[PDB]
Amino acid sequence: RSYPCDEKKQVIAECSNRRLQEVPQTVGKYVTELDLSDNFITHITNESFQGLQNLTKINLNHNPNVNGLNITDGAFLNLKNLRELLLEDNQLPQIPSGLPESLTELSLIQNNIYNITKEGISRLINLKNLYLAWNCYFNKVCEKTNIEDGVFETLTNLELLSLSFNSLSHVPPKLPSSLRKLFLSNTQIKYISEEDFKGLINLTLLDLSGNCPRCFNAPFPCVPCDGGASINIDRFAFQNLTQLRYLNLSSTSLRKINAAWFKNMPHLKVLDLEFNYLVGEIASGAFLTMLPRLEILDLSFNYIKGSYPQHINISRNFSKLLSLRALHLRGYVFQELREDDFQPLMQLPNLSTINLGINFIKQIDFKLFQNFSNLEIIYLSENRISPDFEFDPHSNFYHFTRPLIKPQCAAYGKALDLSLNSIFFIGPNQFENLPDIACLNLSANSNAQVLSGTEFSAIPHVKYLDLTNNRLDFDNASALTELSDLEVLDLSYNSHYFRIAGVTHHLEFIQNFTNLKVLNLSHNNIYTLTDKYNLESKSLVELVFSGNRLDILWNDDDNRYISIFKGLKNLTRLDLSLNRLKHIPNEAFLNLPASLTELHINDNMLKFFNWTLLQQFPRLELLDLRGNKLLFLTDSLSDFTSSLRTLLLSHNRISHLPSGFLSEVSSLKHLDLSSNLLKTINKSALEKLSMLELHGNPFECTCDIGDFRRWMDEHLNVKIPRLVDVICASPGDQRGKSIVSLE
Amino acid sequence: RSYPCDEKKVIAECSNRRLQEVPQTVGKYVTELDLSDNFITHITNESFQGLQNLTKINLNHNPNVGLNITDGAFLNLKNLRELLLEDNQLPQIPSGLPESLTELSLIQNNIYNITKEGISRLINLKNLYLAWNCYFNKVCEKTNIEDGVFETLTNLELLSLSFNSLSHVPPKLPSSLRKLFLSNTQIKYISEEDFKGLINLTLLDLSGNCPRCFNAPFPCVPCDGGASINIDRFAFQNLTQLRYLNLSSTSLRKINAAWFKNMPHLKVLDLEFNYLVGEIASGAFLTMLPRLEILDLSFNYIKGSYPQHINISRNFSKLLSLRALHLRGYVFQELREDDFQPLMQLPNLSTINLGINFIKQIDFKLFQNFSNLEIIYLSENRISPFEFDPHSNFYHFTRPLIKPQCAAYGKALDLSLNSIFFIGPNQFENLPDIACLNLSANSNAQVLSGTEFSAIPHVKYLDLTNNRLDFDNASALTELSDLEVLDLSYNSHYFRIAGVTHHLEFIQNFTNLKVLNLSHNNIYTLTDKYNLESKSLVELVFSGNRLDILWNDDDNRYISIFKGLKNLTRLDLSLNRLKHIPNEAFLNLPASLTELHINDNMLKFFNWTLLQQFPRLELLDLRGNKLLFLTDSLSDFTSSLRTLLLSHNRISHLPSGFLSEVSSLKHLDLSSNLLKTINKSAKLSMLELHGNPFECTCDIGDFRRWMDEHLNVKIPRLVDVICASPGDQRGKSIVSL
Numbered sequence A: 001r002s003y004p005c006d007e008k009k010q011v012i013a014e015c016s017n018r019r020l021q022e023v024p025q026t027v028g029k030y031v032t033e034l035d036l037s038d039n040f041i042t043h044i045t046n047e048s049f050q051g052l053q054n055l056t057k058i059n060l061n062h063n064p065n066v067n068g069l070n071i072t073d074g075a076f077l078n079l080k081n082l083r084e085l086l087l088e089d090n091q092l093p094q095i096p097s098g099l100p101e102s103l104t105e106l107s108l109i110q111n112n113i114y115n116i117t118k119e120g121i122s123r124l125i126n127l128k129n130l131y132l133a134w135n136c137y138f139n140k141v142c143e144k145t146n147i148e149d150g151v152f153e154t155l156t157n158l159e160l161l162s163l164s165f166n167s168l169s170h171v172p173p174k175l176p177s178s179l180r181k182l183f184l185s186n187t188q189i190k191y192i193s194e195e196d197f198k199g200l201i202n203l204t205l206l207d208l209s210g211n212c213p214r215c216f217n218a219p220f221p222c223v224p225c226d227g228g229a230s231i232n233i234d235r236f237a238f239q240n241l242t243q244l245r246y247l248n249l250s251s252t253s254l255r256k257i258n259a260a261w262f263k264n265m266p267h268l269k270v271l272d273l274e275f276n277y278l279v280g281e282i283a284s285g286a287f288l289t290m291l292p293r294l295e296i297l298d299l300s301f302n303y304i305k306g307s308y309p310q311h312i313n314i315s316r317n318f319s320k321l322l323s324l325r326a327l328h329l330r331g332y333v334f335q336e337l338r339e340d341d342f343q344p345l346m347q348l349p350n351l352s353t354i355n356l357g358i359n360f361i362k363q364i365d366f367k368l369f370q371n372f373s374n375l376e377i378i379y380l381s382e383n384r385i386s387p388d389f390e391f392d393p394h395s396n397f398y399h400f401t402r403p404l405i406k407p408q409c410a411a412y413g414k415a416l417d418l419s420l421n422s423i424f425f426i427g428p429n430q431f432e433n434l435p436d437i438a439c440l441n442l443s444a445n446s447n448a449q450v451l452s453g454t455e456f457s458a459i460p461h462v463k464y465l466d467l468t469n470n471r472l473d474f475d476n477a478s479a480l481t482e483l484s485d486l487e488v489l490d491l492s493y494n495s496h497y498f499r500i501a502g503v504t505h506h507l508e509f510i511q512n513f514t515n516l517k518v519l520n521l522s523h524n525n526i527y528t529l530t531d532k533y534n535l536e537s538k539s540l541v542e543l544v545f546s547g548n549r550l551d552i553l554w555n556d557d558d559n560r561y562i563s564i565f566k567g568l569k570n571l572t573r574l575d576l577s578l579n580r581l582k583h584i585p586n587e588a589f590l591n592l593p594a595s596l597t598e599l600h601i602n603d604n605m606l607k608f609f610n611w612t613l614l615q616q617f618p619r620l621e622l623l624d625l626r627g628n629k630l631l632f633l634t635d636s637l638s639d640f641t642s643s644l645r646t647l648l649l650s651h652n653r654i655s656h657l658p659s660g661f662l663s664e665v666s667s668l669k670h671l672d673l674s675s676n677l678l679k680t681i682n683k684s685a686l687e688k689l690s691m692l693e694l695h696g697n698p699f700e701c702t703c704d705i706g707d708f709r710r711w712m713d714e715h716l717n718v719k720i721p722r723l724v725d726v727i728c729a730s731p732g733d734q735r736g737k738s739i740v741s742l743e
Numbered sequence B: 001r002s003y004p005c006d007e008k009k010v011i012a013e014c015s016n017r018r019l020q021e022v023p024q025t026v027g028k029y030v031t032e033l034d035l036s037d038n039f040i041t042h043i044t045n046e047s048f049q050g051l052q053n054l055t056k057i058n059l060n061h062n063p064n065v066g067l068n069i070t071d072g073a074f075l076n077l078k079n080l081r082e083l084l085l086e087d088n089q090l091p092q093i094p095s096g097l098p099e100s101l102t103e104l105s106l107i108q109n110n111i112y113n114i115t116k117e118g119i120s121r122l123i124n125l126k127n128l129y130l131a132w133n134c135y136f137n138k139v140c141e142k143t144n145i146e147d148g149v150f151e152t153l154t155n156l157e158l159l160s161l162s163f164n165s166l167s168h169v170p171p172k173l174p175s176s177l178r179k180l181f182l183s184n185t186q187i188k189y190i191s192e193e194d195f196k197g198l199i200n201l202t203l204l205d206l207s208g209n210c211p212r213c214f215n216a217p218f219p220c221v222p223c224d225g226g227a228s229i230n231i232d233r234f235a236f237q238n239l240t241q242l243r244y245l246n247l248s249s250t251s252l253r254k255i256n257a258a259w260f261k262n263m264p265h266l267k268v269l270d271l272e273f274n275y276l277v278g279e280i281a282s283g284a285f286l287t288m289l290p291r292l293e294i295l296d297l298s299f300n301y302i303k304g305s306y307p308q309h310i311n312i313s314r315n316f317s318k319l320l321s322l323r324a325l326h327l328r329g330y331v332f333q334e335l336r337e338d339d340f341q342p343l344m345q346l347p348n349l350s351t352i353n354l355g356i357n358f359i360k361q362i363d364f365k366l367f368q369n370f371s372n373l374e375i376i377y378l379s380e381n382r383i384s385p386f387e388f389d390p391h392s393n394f395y396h397f398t399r400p401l402i403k404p405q406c407a408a409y410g411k412a413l414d415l416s417l418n419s420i421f422f423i424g425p426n427q428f429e430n431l432p433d434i435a436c437l438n439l440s441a442n443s444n445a446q447v448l449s450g451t452e453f454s455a456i457p458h459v460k461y462l463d464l465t466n467n468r469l470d471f472d473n474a475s476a477l478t479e480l481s482d483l484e485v486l487d488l489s490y491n492s493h494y495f496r497i498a499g500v501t502h503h504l505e506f507i508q509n510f511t512n513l514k515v516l517n518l519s520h521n522n523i524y525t526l527t528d529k530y531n532l533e534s535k536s537l538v539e540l541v542f543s544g545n546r547l548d549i550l551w552n553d554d555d556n557r558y559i560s561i562f563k564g565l566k567n568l569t570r571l572d573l574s575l576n577r578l579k580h581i582p583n584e585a586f587l588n589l590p591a592s593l594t595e596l597h598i599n600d601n602m603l604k605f606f607n608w609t610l611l612q613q614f615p616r617l618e619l620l621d622l623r624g625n626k627l628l629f630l631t632d633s634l635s636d637f638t639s640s641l642r643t644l645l646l647s648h649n650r651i652s653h654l655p656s657g658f659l660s661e662v663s664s665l666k667h668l669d670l671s672s673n674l675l676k677t678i679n680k681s682a683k684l685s686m687l688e689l690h691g692n693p694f695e696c697t698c699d700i701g702d703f704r705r706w707m708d709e710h711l712n713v714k715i716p717r718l719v720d721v722i723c724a725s726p727g728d729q730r731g732k733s734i735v736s737l
């Protein structure tokens, strides 16, 4: 049984974030990939891996976690098959000397390396990917980056070079022509000469973002080119970049795009022009002629500060972008979207996504979207429609790359996102002349209206409706029923009226949906309903009821809600967490749908749980009771269940395991007992279980512990994670140490 | 040193201490004993034997999480006046309670039988509480009141019987009564005989008898066919001294004016939760109330009905003494000027409350034409551009409608929890001279520009919390020259977004601004001006923001973010995720500070030597962090520090000399840390140590010795200052060795 790492085959040794002080000498001979990131390793020497000649990869990132990792000349030199070596965030002062010449990936992102030397690098002929980003940047106290002449020239298999967020001042000379991707973002390069990318006939990606940056409102310390000038790109800079697919020129202070940049660039797929000053160019846009194969165009945050124009001015020459799939125009900042303003786009055959987030737009003429060929995502979030390093070095710096629309919503069809606006009620004609919308997000519009069964009549086929973070007033039982096809409904965070005991709350409308599969009512603080105390639906499969007040609903002095979930005949998944529950009336538990396969009651305050009532739940596979105050287990659990696969009891107050509880239920694969109060496990508990969790428990590590230890050896198919977290509370000398390490 | 209680001046506070039974170590000299919320299971004549000067006993909520009392167990207690036995699941009144009893509370038990044997022996009772013994869907018997049981109680002033099944006003009540409480007692009928003889009654509560049950937040049984309570027209005839009358939720559709004939001093009339819409618009009984100060007609809405207007009878103009009119939940669309006519000449009408009416429009000019409103309460409308506490009102909350700190300044207008998502140019035309304005929770997303409040320029307290304000203009709120308190908490919406502007410059422009709250805005980036500046400002709350990011190691722009706050005495930096504070950032905090909070962050280290630049610093709060050790040189860094809070850190060892370092140091909190000892080595008035894991061997004795030799050093919760080790000491307070 491996220690300290968790070893598997897919041979990986997961060994991260385990407070290891030195490289463990206890790693299998057979491991090919070792991860020791986020540990406290302070030294590496020609000893540190002596056992492990079959190592293809070592991750040593972020050591030591909260001064600097200390690597000896040739410490890795003995590792003949070492391919990928990650050394990020290790406060290195130089590139380690004597690296094995077999390397293909080297990463030194986020260290203190300001000298890139032949001695360090030139001998590594097999390097494919080399990452030196983020060594000198912002107001980090650091030197200008010295790149020794010809250091890269010998790297003739190098496909990816990244030097971003270093002070370079000039594109380094003598780059090998093997290069496919070249990242030089935020490098302080003012000027790009015809010579800089001369040879690079294989380049597919070039990133010159952040050189001559647009600094207004920068969320980082930002230094403009003198006068706020744009980057200066020679007319012929890109001449031989025939294979370029991706070009990032975000925040280079462009007022003018040169069309001839693109003359020899027939395969260009992505042009990123965020954070420039391109309002003028968006109105003119000759360069657009040059880009009929472009799929993605990001023109976000090019606004003129202070200027809030009536309309957006889009060149007719947008019509020429025949391959365009997505257009991003956040942050142009304009008051009104009129049908004609988007004419140049209405015939683009493959234009699927339009993103106008964050434009402070007050009005939109929605009939305009109809006229589009093929829109699948209309993203209008964040407008004014009405009735220890801050930046991840492995992320895009200029936007977020999460999907615009949850995938679960977009699978249903056309998507319209009106989240984070001011649509505080939906009027009669609000959704008029819209397309057949299937996925609709109205989250956080502070919508306080009484829905009544007509508001979505124009878009009756909505299948996924996100109404979270509003303040909806449920005083009408026809609400939403115009949506016969509704499958998913998200009503989380509409507490506003639910908190007020004296106003009606009608949730009757739920029964009227033929196809409703998932319903989210979390964080609504539900403690009182009007007239009908029961949730009913023949359809519903999942109910999420976390963060309401079942403590008040199932209070011992009130019977009204004793069956609140019973009418949910089709239910398999129920979540009752964060309901302040101290106990559940037996009658109320036995009234939970008998169809349940998955029940969560975690993060309440349960002192007692009545295990026997499980008998009314033949199909129950998973039971989550984490984060309650549970004191003991039943000793005959298999009397009460034959289905239970996963039982979670982390973070309770269990001090004893009953007689043979390990082998109590055959069906139990996964049992979680971590962060409880076990000081041992007697032979008593001995007499299909894949995983058993035990970390956090205060173990008494005397010879009383030997029974279980023996058990661990006799059942190595029972996985016990985090063995370094399965710790002796006592005795004094054994305190801190893993139970697994003492004789 | 008292144990296990904390004795004061002579009051033994001994509640919530996990006591299995009454402690036998109670100071013999104690008057009041609090043992509420322990796990006590039995009381005998043995329990309180040694204590004879007992005025009062509290044993509520025992055992907490079945209180057996023996007959006559309290008999030996010759001076016992007050006895609290709430929430003990008693099956009967206990027998043999002493005669000296002036106050008995038996709220929340299982007592269904009120007996002479229990009660009639208690000649001296002023106050008797028997409420909440059988109610709702509790399994309980109808309540038996033995005939005449209260007859002998001729000093009885308060009798509370609410929330029990009575069905009739028990007969034969001592005429001493000032206050009779009979809410939710299932009494359909009030006869002429029921009160007749109670000539000193100032208060009568008949609420919840024949309840209005629609949308009730509790299991609710109406009288047959929604019928009203039946009150005999001479039922209140000899109730000449009545000041408070509660008829909430009695299903009244009609009020008999003549109930108020002999009652010309009624001050409070509660008519919540009935059906008095017609009565409100006709209302002869409004003539019979010339001294009435507070009238509550809330929640008399007709369900479904949502009328254009509110119909207020002319006769409201006879309510000459009216100070506060509560008209929640009438439910209607539009408040016109003509509709509040009757109200305009009432000289003392200071408070008008229309919360929760779903109102869409108001003619704000109508409030001018009143004689002297101090409080216009319009929260929770549609304006645009055991569950229950047995010591609270059942039908409304009793907290001030407007926070006292805001009302203190003058006329107040509360428009919270509406949909005023921007303030238009006339939103505040025709208003009185408002001094306190609440616009919280309106989802207002506007760019304030220094003109929106011109029509009410003397606002001194402005609550704009829970909005989504867009700070894109340095002149925001600058028309309010008199502004003293500005609360902008919970306006994260746009501060989240790196790409839009965030202009806080406007703050320097106020001569008289004292308090600024910017909590929970997740502020991490600001536009152009990176500094907060004010000559006047005295307190800044900045909790719930991102100083971890503002003060990041690779950015210098915010290193002086608070320096320009030259007059500042209180600064809150809690909940900012700070793992460490740059030294140059700390030194840049205003030197005027007297109080600094940096609790609930994640600090591993603290540069104590930095305290030399803060010579007026009295309170330093570092609770809920990850500090691993204290300086050993504190005397050298500060001579001003009185309170030092380190609760909930990871401190393992107390530095030699620490306990006698500092002269200014009154109060030191080290509860919930990792102290195993306080070795001999290590103005002091209080020292908190509960929650630490002490080694309870002989090493500990030097500290015990220390405790004895300094009784002037309070150490609360000694019950909770527990041993972790060794195995035979685990569990035991460190005094009990």
Ligand SMILES: Nc1nc2c(ncn2[C@@H]2O[C@H](COP(=O)(O)O[C@H]3[C@@H](O)[C@H](n4ccc(=O)[nH]c4=O)O[C@@H]3COP(=O)(O)O)[C@H]3OP(=O)(O)O[C@H]32)c(=O)[nH]1
Binding pocket: A269, A270, A295, A296, A298, A300, A325, A326, A328, A330, A353, A396, A399, A400, A401, A402, A403, A404, A405
């Ligand atoms: N460019 C951009 N993208 C944003 C923005 N806000 C959200 N996003 C989303 O990032 C996601 C990643 O976009 P990004 O353009 O940064 O990177 C793309 C594009 O550069 C590129 N791509 C993607 C699609 C395509 O048709 N052609 C193409 O070249 O492949 C990357 C991987 O993204 P994937 O599409 O596989 O998730 C997109 O998923 P999205 O359709 O929901 O809108 C995108 C934003 O402001 N700008």
Ligand SMILES: Nc1nc2c(ncn2[C@@H]2O[C@H](COP(=O)(O)O[C@H]3[C@@H](O)[C@H](n4ccc(=O)[nH]c4=O)O[C@@H]3COP(=O)(O)O)[C@H]3OP(=O)(O)O[C@H]32)c(=O)[nH]1
Binding pocket: B267, B268, B293, B294, B296, B298, B323, B324, B326, B328, B351, B393, B396, B397, B398, B399, B400, B401, B402
């Ligand atoms: N009656 C009533 N009061 C409500 C309601 N909602 C909030 N409140 C507030 O609770 C508070 C308590 O009022 P309530 O009528 O329940 O009880 C009063 C009144 O019954 C009575 N009183 C108060 C003032 C007075 O002039 N005359 C008078 O008889 O003494 C009690 C204590 O008041 P306090 O000392 O807390 O101000 C008031 O302080 P408030 O001015 O903000 O408006 C009140 C509500 O819906 N109804």
Ligand SMILES: *[C@@H]1O[C@H](CO)[C@@H](O[C@@H]2O[C@H](CO)[C@@H](O[C@@H]3O[C@H](CO)[C@@H](O)[C@H](O)[C@@H]3O)[C@H](O)[C@H]2NC(C)=O)[C@H](O)[C@H]1NC(C)=O
Binding pocket: A181, A185, A205, A207, A209, A246, A247, A248, A270, A272, A393, A394, A395, A396, A397, A398, A399
């Ligand atoms: C400028 O524009 C280009 C957009 O083409 C950006 O390149 C993209 O950079 C991200 C972040 O490093 C890369 O994503 C990462 O990819 C690796 C490898 O597959 C994976 O380990 C990470 O988790 C993450 O997915 C992405 O590959 C890359 N795009 C392409 C086509 O290679 C560039 O980041 C932009 N520059 C800045 C500063 O925003």
Ligand SMILES: *[C@@H]1O[C@H](CO)[C@@H](O[C@@H]2O[C@H](CO)[C@@H](O[C@@H]3O[C@H](CO)[C@@H](O)[C@H](O)[C@@H]3O)[C@H](O)[C@H]2NC(C)=O)[C@H](O)[C@H]1NC(C)=O
Binding pocket: A408, A409, A468, A488, A490, A492, A518, A519, A520, A522, A542, A544
């Ligand atoms: C309201 O509850 C719904 C339903 O539970 C939440 O949406 C669901 O969120 C879960 C994860 O939180 C999604 O499951 C995940 O699927 C992904 C991708 O396939 C998988 O990688 C994850 O391990 C996980 O299984 C689930 O698909 C999603 N369901 C739907 C229908 O969208 C929702 O987040 C809740 N709303 C709020 C505001 O919290």
Ligand SMILES: *[C@@H]1O[C@H](CO)[C@@H](O[C@@H]2O[C@H](CO)[C@@H](O[C@@H]3O[C@H](CO)[C@@H](O)[C@H](O)[C@@H]3O)[C@H](O)[C@H]2NC(C)=O)[C@H](O)[C@H]1NC(C)=O
Binding pocket: B162, B183, B203, B205, B207, B244, B245, B246, B268, B270, B390, B391, B392, B393, B394, B395, B396
């Ligand atoms: C019916 O209306 C009357 C209006 O007076 C309400 O009477 C009030 O009842 C509350 C609830 O206990 C009393 O509050 C208590 O005041 C005493 C003062 O010594 C204090 O010790 C308690 O902690 C508690 O705060 C309040 O005094 C009382 N008002 C008067 C003038 O006595 C009554 O509660 C209403 N009934 C229901 C069921 O809501």
Ligand SMILES: *[C@@H]1O[C@H](CO)[C@@H](O[C@@H]2O[C@H](CO)[C@@H](O[C@@H]3O[C@H](CO)[C@@H](O)[C@H](O)[C@@H]3O)[C@H](O)[C@H]2NC(C)=O)[C@H](O)[C@H]1NC(C)=O
Binding pocket: B405, B406, B465, B485, B487, B489, B515, B516, B517, B519, B539, B541
């Ligand atoms: C925004 O910050 C202000 C200033 O901290 C908060 O208002 C202040 O709230 C405290 C209590 O948290 C008040 O002090 C308390 O006063 C009461 C009554 O005098 C007293 O009983 C307490 O012992 C304590 O002294 C303080 O007066 C009050 N300040 C003002 C100017 O009203 C405010 O609550 C914060 N807002 C939010 C939404 O968190």
Ligand SMILES: *[C@@H]1O[C@H](CO)[C@@H](O[C@@H]2O[C@H](CO)[C@@H](O)[C@H](O)[C@H]2NC(C)=O)[C@H](O)[C@H]1NC(C)=O
Binding pocket: A381, A404, A405, A406, A409, A419, A420, A441, A442, A443, A444, A466
């Ligand atoms: C509806 O719009 C809201 C608001 O933008 C989306 O909420 C975001 O969701 C992502 C992923 O769930 C989170 O990481 C963000 O934190 C959320 N933002 C906020 C402000 O809450 C929501 O996901 C959208 N719904 C769908 C179905 O796409």
Ligand SMILES: *[C@@H]1O[C@H](CO)[C@@H](O[C@@H]2O[C@H](CO)[C@@H](O)[C@H](O)[C@H]2NC(C)=O)[C@H](O)[C@H]1NC(C)=O
Binding pocket: B379, B401, B402, B403, B406, B416, B417, B438, B439, B440, B441, B463
């Ligand atoms: C402004 O309006 C809101 C209306 O809710 C008040 O916020 C409430 O404050 C009370 C008293 O502190 C709290 O107990 C409530 O929980 C708060 N409710 C909400 C929804 O936040 C606020 O106090 C009012 N401000 C002033 C100055 O009176």
Ligand SMILES: O=c1ccn([C@@H]2O[C@H](CO)[C@@H](O)[C@H]2O)c(=O)[nH]1
Binding pocket: A450, A473, A475, A502, A503, A504, B301, B302, B303, B304, B305, B306, B331, B358
């Ligand atoms: O927007 C509105 C308008 C009126 N009502 C009415 O107010 C009462 C209490 O909520 C109910 O009868 C309901 O009809 C609402 O709930 N919401």
Ligand SMILES: O=c1ccn([C@@H]2O[C@H](CO)[C@@H](O)[C@H]2O)c(=O)[nH]1
Binding pocket: A303, A304, A305, A306, A307, A308, A333, A360, B447, B470, B472, B499, B500, B501
């Ligand atoms: O409501 C608005 C309208 C426009 N802008 C403008 O948008 C840009 C980014 O915030 C800035 O120039 C600002 O003037 C806003 O910030 N908020």
Ligand SMILES: *[C@@H]1O[C@H](CO)[C@@H](O)[C@H](O)[C@H]1NC(C)=O
Binding pocket: A043, A070, A071, A072
């Ligand atoms: C790191 O360790 C090496 C030897 O292992 C030593 O020569 C060197 O001085 C150390 N450097 C630091 C800064 O610890």
Ligand SMILES: *[C@@H]1O[C@H](CO)[C@@H](O)[C@H](O)[C@H]1NC(C)=O
Binding pocket: A349, A350
């Ligand atoms: C673009 O849309 C056309 C139809 O207008 C379709 O034939 C073609 O397959 C689409 N192109 C891609 C790459 O999806």
Ligand SMILES: *[C@@H]1O[C@H](CO)[C@@H](O)[C@H](O)[C@H]1NC(C)=O
Binding pocket: A452, A453, A475, A476, A477, A478
């Ligand atoms: C629901 O609202 C509609 C629209 O006004 C109305 O016709 C209907 O009567 C309402 N139904 C209920 C349950 O009140």
Ligand SMILES: *[C@@H]1O[C@H](CO)[C@@H](O)[C@H](O)[C@H]1NC(C)=O
Binding pocket: A453, A478, A481, A511, A512
């Ligand atoms: C909703 O379903 C119920 C049947 O349970 C029915 O009474 C009602 O008319 C339905 N309303 C709509 C709009 O489908």
Ligand SMILES: *[C@@H]1O[C@H](CO)[C@@H](O)[C@H](O)[C@H]1NC(C)=O
Binding pocket: A514, A515, A538, A539, A540, A541, A570
């Ligand atoms: C029950 O749930 C299943 C999904 O597992 C679904 O196919 C079916 O429609 C549901 N039953 C009814 C009556 O809707």
Ligand SMILES: *[C@@H]1O[C@H](CO)[C@@H](O)[C@H](O)[C@H]1NC(C)=O
Binding pocket: B320, B321, B322, B347, B348
């Ligand atoms: C109004 O209040 C004042 C001051 O408390 C009081 O003296 C006066 O009698 C009241 N006026 C009336 C008409 O009740």
